Structure 1
């Protein structure tokens, strides 16, 4: 909610692992970049405008590389039995603003999955399609870093998908959460990368 600056690549923690994204093995996951969740920042205020610039930039590189683009999004007016224990933590869920943000709207060839849990693997065909297409690297962007981003990355790593969390193309509740996720990713589950390194 309160304005902060996306960390600079030199401030990212060091990686344990020496992975490298290859476009035949890769998918770009654009995680929960719905207007409902970006509303909780001030759009005009950091980290939003840099966030929206680097994801648009990276998506653009994906179509060029024919790296698939998958959008995840939570559906409005969820069945309380289907939302289950998130309600205990987040209320009854979103009713409005379900679409992707304007400057990241999906164009024709992209894919949109309905997202039921922190992890984008739960109850989606993401894993099976990635197995089918022989893609085993997941490049992750969006919000929020220490919740959905972190959980998707943990799931990916455990299902043998190399997750690449893009440090400067995610945002979070706070610079502290933001820095905390990247430290956690770099130390236990994957690779923290940058738009320029990518």
Structure 2
């Protein structure tokens, strides 16, 4: 059960080492694991969940207007233990219900959903293959949880020659400490930490 916390302000975000900028023709918006199951660990009516949903919703609308593909990731229910593998040792047998995307962020016509198996959105999915085929090499990452799946996805993007853009105010985590630590790690070793405000004109 995640204790309530406020999404940090863009002024507290660490400074970027890299000077990348989102270009609509090169970008993909990834809404990472925004399933009811994962959001249920927080009190939905409490911070960081209302700001997280409002910021992702605004960014998603902007992506659709800019012709930026929207990709959702979702873990499947009743996973085969062989397929789930070493995750069981840390998290148990996994979700059986609430596999749907939170109603506030329900996918619209044209949006794509990929079945998620590991922390990284690139493991066992068509994401790299689709990014290569469409010449898209920039990944805008939003969702939960910053230090786990968001971090692993960004690390993979980076290693696969895809520029990761982690939206600091459109991610949530187990705590504010974990949230801040992830942004610091991204700016220092993986990619770009951006904000809804900085990102808005680049799209």
Q: TM-score per shorter chain, which class?
A: over 0.9
Query: How many pairs does the alignment contain?
Result: 198
Query: Structure 1 residue runs of 4+, over 2 Å off?
Result: none
Q: 1:44 and 1:123 mapped to 2: Cα distance?
A: 34
Deviation at 1:55, TM superposition (A): 0.2
- Aligned partners of 1:80, 1:3: CA distance in 2, in Å? 32
Cα separation, 2, equivalents of 1:197 and 1:168: 11
Root-mean-square deviation (CA, aligned residues, Å) is 0.3
Which stretches in structure 2 are left out of the alignment for 5+ residues? none
Q: Could you say which residue in structure 1 is the equivalent of 2:154?
A: 153
Shift in Å, 1:23: 0.1
Shift of 1:47: 0.2
Instruction: Give CA deviations for 1:65-121 in whole Å, capped at 9, x if unaligned.
Output: 010000000000000000000000000000000000000000011000000000000
Distance between the aligned counterparts of 2:42 and 2:85, measured in 1?
Answer: 27
Q: Deviations over 1:9-44 (max 9, x none)?
A: 000000000000000000000000000000000000
* TM-score normalised to structure 2 length: 0.97
Gaps of 5+ in 1: none
CA distance in 1, matches of 2:158, 2:194: 16
Q: Helix, strand or coil for the counterpart of 2:196?
A: coil
